[PDB]
Amino acid sequence: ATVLLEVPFSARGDRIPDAVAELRTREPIRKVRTITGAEAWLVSSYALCTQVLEDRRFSMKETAAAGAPRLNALTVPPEVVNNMGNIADAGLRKAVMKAITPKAPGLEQFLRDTANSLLDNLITEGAPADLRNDFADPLATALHCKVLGIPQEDGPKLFRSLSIAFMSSADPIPAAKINWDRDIEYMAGILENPNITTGLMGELSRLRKDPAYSHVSDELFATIGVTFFGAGVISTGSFLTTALISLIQRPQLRNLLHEKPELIPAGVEELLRINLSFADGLPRLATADIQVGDVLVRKGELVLVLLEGANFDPEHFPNPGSIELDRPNPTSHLAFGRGQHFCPGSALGRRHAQIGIEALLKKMPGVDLAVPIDQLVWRTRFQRRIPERLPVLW
Ligand code: HEM
Ligand SMILES: O=C1CN(CCCn2ccnc2)CCN1Cc1ccc(F)cc1
- Relative to beta strand 391-393, strand 302-305 is unpaired
Give the single-character DSSP code of 382.
B
Q: Which residues of 312-324 are buried (b: 16+ CB within 10 A; e: fewer)?
A: bbeebbeebeebe
Q: Is the Cβ–Cβ distance between 244 and 136 less than 8 Å?
A: yes
C-alpha 277 – ligand 1 centre gap (Å):
12
Pocket test for ligand 2, best of 72, 75, 83 (most atoms within 8 A of CB): 83
DSSP state of 284: E
Any atom of ligand 1 within 6 Å of the Cβ of 356: no
**341 Cα: distance to centroid of ligand 1 (angstroms):** 8
**Radius of gyration (Cα) for the chain, nearest Å?**
21
Resolution in A for the shown PDB structure? 1.6
Pocket of ligand 2 (CB under 6 A): 75-76, 80, 83, 165, 227, 230-231, 235, 343
DSSP H helices in the chain? 18-26, 46-53, 83-89, 93-99, 107-125, 137-148, 155-159, 162-165, 174-191, 199-208, 218-248, 251-259, 264-273, 307-311, 346-363
| Nearest alpha-carbon partner for 202 in 274, 128, 151 | 151
The contacts of residue 268 (CB under 8 Å, 6+ apart) are 243, 350, 353, 354, 357
Catalogue all structural domains in the chain, each as residue range(s) with its CATH number: 1-394 (1.10.630.10)
Report the DSSP pairing between strands 39-43 and 302-305: parallel
Looking at the CA of 166, which ligand is closest?
2
Contact 119, 359 (CB under 8 A): yes
